[PDB]
Amino acid sequence: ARHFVLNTGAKIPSVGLGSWQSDPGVVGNAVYAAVKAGYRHIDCARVYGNEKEIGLALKKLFEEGVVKREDMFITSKLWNDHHAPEDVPEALNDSLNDLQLEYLDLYLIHWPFFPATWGAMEKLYDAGKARAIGVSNFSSKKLGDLLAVARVPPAVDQVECHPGWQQTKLHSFCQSTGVHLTAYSPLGNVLKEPIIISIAEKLGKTSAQVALRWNIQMGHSVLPKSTNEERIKQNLDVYDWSIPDDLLAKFSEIKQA
Numbered sequence: 001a002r003h004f005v006l007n008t009g010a011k012i013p014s015v016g017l018g019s020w021q022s023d024p025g026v027v028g029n030a031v032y033a034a035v036k037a038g039y040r041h042i043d044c045a046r047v048y049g050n051e052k053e054i055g056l057a058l059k060k061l062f063e064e065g066v067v068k069r070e071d072m073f074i075t076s077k078l079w080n081d082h083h084a085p086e087d088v089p090e091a092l093n094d095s096l097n098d099l100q101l102e103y104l105d106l107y108l109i110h111w112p113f114f115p116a117t118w119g120a121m122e123k124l125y126d127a128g129k130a131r132a133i134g135v136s137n138f139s140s141k142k143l144g145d146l147l148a149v150a151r152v153p154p155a156v157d158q159v160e161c162h163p164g165w166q167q168t169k170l171h172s173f174c175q176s177t178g179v180h181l182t183a184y185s186p187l188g189n190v191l192k193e194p195i196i197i198s199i200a201e202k203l204g205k206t207s208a209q210v211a212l213r214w215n216i217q218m219g220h221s222v223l224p225k226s227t228n229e230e231r232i233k234q235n236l237d238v239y240d241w242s243i244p245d246d247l248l249a250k251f252s253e254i255k256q257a
């Protein structure tokens with residue numbers, strides 16, 4: 001498919017637009033271009049200070065009938081380290097107001113780490129303000145600690161994952177536990193890796209396409225970021241072809257960062 005299914009049963013489109021900060025309008029324009037090209041998944045973070053701009057882009061898309069709210073998968077994330085658990089629902093409330101949404105499909109949190117911070121997340125899940133809840137940057141050990149005590153297990157662990165940083169341990173642990181791994185920075189320069197250039201030539205694809213497809217074939221969603229409209233489109237062209245097993249195996253020889 002063009003999606004994975006989370007432990008909640010919800011579908012998460014395999015490709016999303018990644019989150020970042022840029023000059024005024026740049027991110028909104030990317031969101032708009034992405035969704036027009038077929039993206040159904042947008043990753044956001046209040047830390048970038050741009051969720052109102054993204055909300056303006058989403059609002060345009062919806063008003064224009066490009067997509068319905070229900071066919072979008074919107075994610076936001078909170079970095080809550082050393083803040084109160086009570087701040088969590090307030091931040092979600094703010095993100096919803098800025099994005100002009102009634103619910104998030106996914107809300108992710110980081111804190112140092114029964115944890116009351118996670119408790120606050122569970123309540124938002126119970127309420128349907130966050131249809132799925134997860135974590136960002138949790139190692140296998142920390143993700144396992146959380147799984148051992150949570151009432152609602154994390155749906156997602158969003159981490160840096162790419163051919164130069166393959167997260168092999170965490171990938172195995174997510175697969176065994178049913179937590180879905182979303183790869184941020186899925187292009188890392190790993191696009192100059194000769195193994196990737198070679199596979200790209202053998203398959204008649206770009207280096208980025210190969211790198212993205214590799215992650216998808218490990219069962220991971222990917223969050224490529226681009227301000228270029230053509231690269232936005234190419235970053236979605238990861239579905240109607242695959243990397244064969246013999247070429248997929250060569251990824252094991254790439255040097256890790």
Ligand SMILES: Nc1ncnc2c1ncn2[C@@H]1O[C@H](COP(=O)(O)O)[C@@H](O)[C@H]1OP(=O)(O)O
Nearest residue numbers: 185186187188208223224225226227228231234
């Ligand atoms: N299809 C692509 N081919 C090459 N570079 C890309 C592609 N898509 C995005 N990028 C670039 O990758 C970087 C983001 O990588 P990551 O997601 O791993 O952090 C950006 O500098 C972005 O530049 P650009 O915005 O000019 O497209």
Ligand SMILES: [Cl-]
Nearest residue numbers: 046047078079
């Ligand atoms: Cl934050």
